[PDB]
């Protein structure tokens, strides 16, 4: 149960971030891939590994769970959502309330109420990758 | 920025202390893990 | 056919009856029935348990006399508190957390009578200093295996510290359905009563014992640390100039610096000062 | 800037020093907790030889020569190769 | 926001932001030039 | 705030530190009246993003009673949620190979439930159930345990899509389809709460109405959790009475959901009546399901207090029950989250290292 908790935590730290943040990101992702393909592990260890893979690839590098807000305060709905998810020792079937903890990011340029402008932004810093690297 | 430096020194004094207190707690906990094993 | 991560609120007096009955009938594999009630599906609570003498036939259903059981139940109803029968316990010196063939058969009869009739294995002989074994499981029909096996339901609770014994794995019990988690009714007005009263040492901390056996004890202490003198001597000339850890690993001696550590010397020091302070405290009391 | 940054810094570092210092009593208690090892009447099965540390081969009197684990409490100081030794009653471990 | 830190603002485009493009969030675009264009449907 | 140019960042942010919901309502009204589109529109979202419960509701109440209708809609966040949904539709990324190897990893243990959840986490907000539908059909053999997690998986993929996902989950009517599999109905209510997450008002109303008019066997678990999810922090009278009735009826099988719903409805309210009812019910009952759900309720009963939580948790986390210890620290952890509160960290680490109690 500590091993699966570490896998979930190592997945949670690695959500929405690629290997640019740390070279170990790819190593942990392949670690998650090989342990989920390893079916001879313990039931609890395998369970947390698959939940780790799910939260890591939550929405396909599209949505994320973050406690930091725009001004930096805690997002309490996300806080309790993690609390319920963490409460798998009490009740795993009751530990699926994390769906409210979704905190996606977007830089919007919506001038109108319905019309969506072609607000487009560029980048020029080579060590920066995101948007579905498609590992396997 | 002088009381700045004095507080840094007192920060440095405590951090030097807290190095081994963490290490003492960790190593003794390892000992407790060993005896439990 | 629903068996989640069930937990047993076994009572302390039920434990005491178990150990007393096992200590009395050690080699006889004495039998008994765990007096509990299903308040719901999985939060089973056992408050009382009784001791019954195993018949000369051995492990048999008729050994638990029905008339005697009925009279015992009536006595509990009149004096005490009534409680249902949904379980059984058995001192099992033979082998570990599993059930013998006859134990499985009589548990099957109990399962036919009751709803679950949990199969509890308590080993009176393996429980010696720190580990007492109370493992409960259920017998299953052939249908549970042909459907989605491991009747352990979808939760992450019964997987906590679930280490069935190797003999239990190769038997059907503790493998047919699941292993039941155990809990102890450490409620207050009960647990505070036990810790305050049973483990009683309240004025016994005033003992003086200056030299009742301590003059010769100090002689032994000096002799033991004289051996430490030779050991801590032996170390200082070993003390090689090749990263002494390299020398130490292949030449372990368990000397004063290595294994007979300062803690033992602290024990000797604490013993001396304790007798000193007790003698000195009563000396100033002597007025 | 750095004035209050170091102020709070002093506070926090100071706190974790004392907080982590609070467990040494707990861990000295834990170290003195784990040293029970039954402390009960042992038995004899003669030692064969100390193959390594934490591993050993002993021979009980009825034969039944089985590999055991050697605790660090007793070692070469009295662990001569073929001398009669003492072992736990139900554990048969070198004591 | 870490990606925004290494991001470069495209001032060449007709659209310029009122809220600074340094911290993530929602920004309303200024009223663009007459004969409105540059419409996308994400 | 008094700078001549009404810059967005300073007046949105400073007013919430000083806790002036009336003042920020007044400035929004003046921005609406002057019809400064950039100023009024951006500040309203920035208030929505930076403020929290009991603040945004107060401001919109004082704003409601030129762009007032727009400010009301955008503070409610339905347009923002819709934008998140449409982005989640467009830039969604799925891994078919990962769907298959999880299906390969499917075994008789709880691992098959994990695979379904992981695939649904990857397929969150897709509004298309073909791979997941096939996976559920393939795994439709171990029921009566894995429905709650399977319906959770269906909830997360179709969350916040009540226009069609309500009907998509309503296609699983429990009575005719499967009476024997008793978690069919509880799964239906549970997905309804998850699908209608971030939605309140009428969403709260029909949830509580059907929870009043239903059985008490399995439907109450998902329904109460969905009711609290829709009524997070509202603490409205009608749901509170139902939750209190469910709790004090000693219906232990559901008390886990009742307690969890109590915390959601009293999210951050620091209701002294609620906490004393939660504490008092703790000594009265001795059911693990009740304790864990009541543990949740005390967990999110309050946050950001720093004036009463320290004394409350010093009394509750010290209490006899390890569940009360665990729930007590849950309260202080999220009540002092956001700042390095020395006293809270002191008590939090002390109970970590001193007591040997595992909980």
UniProtKB/Swiss-Prot annotation, chain A:
PC repeats lie at residues 5-45, 48-80. It comes from the Eukaryota. The modification N6-acetyllysine is found at residue 39. Belongs to the proteasome subunit S1 family. Component of the 26S proteasome, a multiprotein complex involved in the ATP-dependent degradation of ubiquitinated proteins. This complex plays a key role in the maintenance of protein homeostasis by removing misfolded or damaged proteins, which could impair cellular functions, and by removing proteins whose functions are no longer required. Therefore, the proteasome participates in numerous cellular processes, including cell cycle progression, apoptosis, or DNA damage repair. Component of the 19S proteasome regulatory particle complex. The 26S proteasome consists of a 20S core particle (CP) and two 19S regulatory subunits (RP). The regulatory particle is made of a lid composed of 9 subunits, a base containing 6 ATPases and few additional components including PSMD1. Interacts with ADRM1. Interacts with ZFAND1. This is 26S proteasome non-ATPase regulatory subunit 1. The lineage of its organism: Eukaryota, Metazoa, Chordata, Craniata, Vertebrata.
UniProtKB/Swiss-Prot annotation, chain B:
Disulfide bonds: none annotated. Belongs to the AAA ATPase family. This is 26S proteasome regulatory subunit 8. The gene is PSMC5. It is found in: Cytoplasm; Nucleus. Component of the 19S proteasome regulatory particle complex. The 26S proteasome consists of a 20S core particle (CP) and two 19S regulatory subunits (RP). The regulatory particle is made of a lid composed of 9 subunits, a base containing 6 ATPases including PSMC5 and few additional components. Component of a complex with USP49 and RUVBL1. Interacts with PRPF19. Interacts with TRIM5. Interacts with NDC80. Interacts with PAAF1. Interacts, in vitro, with the thyroid hormone receptor (in a thyroid hormone T3-dependent manner) and with retinoid X receptor (RXR). Interacts with ERCC6. Component of the 26S proteasome, a multiprotein complex involved in the ATP-dependent degradation of ubiquitinated proteins. This complex plays a key role in the maintenance of protein homeostasis by removing misfolded or damaged proteins, which could impair cellular functions, and by removing proteins whose functions are no longer required. Therefore, the proteasome participates in numerous cellular processes, including cell cycle progression, apoptosis, or DNA damage repair. The chain holds residues 22 to 58 of 406 of the full protein.
UniProtKB/Swiss-Prot annotation, chain C:
One of its GO terms (molecular function) is metallopeptidase activity. GO terms for cellular component: cytosol; cytosolic proteasome complex; extracellular region; ficolin-1-rich granule lumen; nucleoplasm; nucleus; proteasome accessory complex; proteasome complex. Disulfide bonds: none annotated. Its EC number is 3.4.19.-. The modification Phosphoserine is found at residues 127, 201. Residues 8-143 form the MPN domain. The modification Phosphothreonine is found at residue 243. SMART domains: JAB_MPN (SM00232). Zn(2+) binds at residues 90, 92, 103. A motif (JAMM motif) lies at residues 90-103. Keywords: DNA damage, DNA repair, Hydrolase, Metal-binding, Metalloprotease, Phosphoprotein, Protease, Proteasome, Ubl conjugation pathway, Zinc. InterPro entries: JAMM/MPN+_dom (IPR000555), JAMM_MPN+_peptidase_M67A (IPR050242), MPN (IPR037518), RPN11_C (IPR056263). Widely expressed. Highest levels in heart and skeletal muscle. GO terms for biological process: double-strand break repair via homologous recombination; double-strand break repair via nonhomologous end joining; proteasome-mediated ubiquitin-dependent protein catabolic process; protein deubiquitination; protein K63-linked deubiquitination; regulation of proteasomal protein catabolic process; response to ethanol; ubiquitin-dependent protein catabolic process. It comes from the Eukaryota. SUPFAM superfamilies: JAB1/MPN domain. Belongs to the peptidase M67A family. PSMD14 subfamily. This is 26S proteasome non-ATPase regulatory subunit 14.
Curated annotation (Swiss-Prot), chain D:
Component of the 19S proteasome regulatory particle complex. The 26S proteasome consists of a 20S core particle (CP) and two 19S regulatory subunits (RP). The regulatory particle is made of a lid composed of 9 subunits, a base containing 6 ATPases including PSMC4 and few additional components. Interacts with NR1I3. Interacts with PAAF1. Interacts with TRIM5. Interacts with ZFAND1. Signal peptide: none annotated. Belongs to the AAA ATPase family. The chain holds residues 46 to 140 of 418 of the full protein. It is found in: Cytoplasm; Nucleus. Component of the 26S proteasome, a multiprotein complex involved in the ATP-dependent degradation of ubiquitinated proteins. This complex plays a key role in the maintenance of protein homeostasis by removing misfolded or damaged proteins, which could impair cellular functions, and by removing proteins whose functions are no longer required. Therefore, the proteasome participates in numerous cellular processes, including cell cycle progression, apoptosis, or DNA damage repair. It comes from Homo sapiens (Human). This is 26S proteasome regulatory subunit 6B.
